[PDB]
From a paper:
All six mATG8s are essential for autophagy, are conjugated to autophagosomes and serve to recruit two broad classes of molecules: autophagy receptors and autophagy adaptors. On the other hand, autophagy adaptor proteins interact with mATG8 proteins on the convex autophagosomal membrane surface and can regulate autophagosome formation (ULK1/2 16), autophagosome transport (FYCO1 17), crosstalk with the endocytic network (TBC1D5 18) and autophagosome fusion with the lysosome (PLEKHM1 19), but are themselves not degraded by autophagy. Structural studies have shown that the side chains of the aromatic residue (Θ) within the core LIR motif are placed deep inside of a hydrophobic pocket (HP1) on the Atg8/LC3/GABARAP surface, formed between α‐helix 2 and β‐strand 2, while side chains of the hydrophobic LIR residues (Γ) occupies a second hydrophobic pocket (HP2) between β‐strand 2 and α‐helix 3 (reviewed in 3, 23, 24). To provide a molecular basis for the specificity of the PLEKHM1‐LIR interaction with the mATG8 proteins, we solved the crystal structures of PLEKHM1‐LIR in complex with the LC3A, LC3C, GABARAP and GABARAP‐L1 proteins.
To obtain the complex structures, we created chimeric proteins consisting of the mATG8 C‐terminally fused to the LIR sequence with a Gly/Ser linker. Crystals diffracted to 2.50 Å for PLEKHM1629–638‐LC3A2–121, 2.00 Å for PLEKHM1629–638‐GABARAP2–117 and 2.90 Å for PLEKHM1629–638‐GABARAP‐L12–117. The four monomers in asymmetric unit of PLEKHM1630–638‐LC3A2–121 overlay with RMSD of 0.174 Å. The PLEKHM1‐LIR moiety represented in sticks is in the same orientation in all the monomers with the key amino acid W635 aligned well. Partner residues in each mATG8 protein are given W635 of PLEKHM1 interacts with E19 of LC3A with 3.5 Å distance, with D19 of LC3B and E25 in LC3C in similar way, but the bond distances are higher (6.2 Å and 4.5 Å), suggesting a weaker interaction. For the LC3 subfamily proteins, the hydrogen bonding distance of N637 (LIR) with K30 (LC3) correlates with binding affinity to the LIR peptide. For LC3A, two of the four monomers in the ASU do not show this interaction and in LC3C, one of the eight monomers in the ASU do not have this interaction, suggesting that this interaction is variable in the LC3 structures. However, we observed that in all LC3 subfamily proteins, the surface to which V636 binds was stabilized by an intramolecular salt bridge, which is absent in GABARAP subfamily structure. In the LC3 subfamily proteins (left plot), R70/70/76 (LC3A/B/C) side chains are closer to the CG1/2 atoms of V638 (˜3.6/3.7/4.1 Å), while for GABARAP subfamily (right plot) these distances are 4.6 Å (GABARAP) and 4.2 Å (GABARAP‐L1). Due to this closer proximity, R70/70/76 polar groups become more fixed in their position and organize neighbouring negatively charged carboxyl groups of the D48/48/54 via salt bridges.
Author numbering: 6 to 129
């Protein structure tokens, strides 16, 4: 009769913050930093092999390409060269995209104005 507790990090960002609150937050952030893209990065629901990230919200400069971003989130997870890691924007593996995230943002962003990314060990 154990009770399994937690965790606020296992709760999706969209359930932690209301749609209205998220829309507001994105608006302030872009005003304060027009230079940057607001990004939400979470572990895939199915994923158990990779560790969970300490943080969820990332402020990314427009010029950074997704190939560069994949490298950054990867060092942060302290992954071995051998571990498989994919960073998906709307279900596409970004470690080949050299396009600036500012261009991805206009095309792929959420209704709330955030750009949402999910990471896992397999691509599908």
């Amino acid at each position: 009769e154990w009770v399994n507790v937690g965790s606020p990090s296992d709760r999706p960002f969209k359930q932690r913050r209301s749609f209205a609150d998220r829309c507001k937050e994105v608006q302030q952030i872009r005003d304060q930093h027009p230079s940057k893209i607001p990004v939400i990065i979470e572990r895939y629901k199915g994923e158990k092999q990779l560790p969970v990230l300490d943080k969820t919200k990332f402020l990314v400069p427009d010029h950074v390409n997704m190939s560069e971003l994949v490298k950054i989130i990867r060092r942060r997870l302290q992954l071995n060269p051998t571990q498989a890691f994919f960073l998906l924007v709307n279900q596409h593996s970004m470690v080949s995209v050299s396009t600036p995230i500012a261009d991805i943002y206009e095309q792929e962003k959420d209704e709330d104005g955030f750009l949402y990314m999910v990471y896992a060990s397999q691509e599908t």
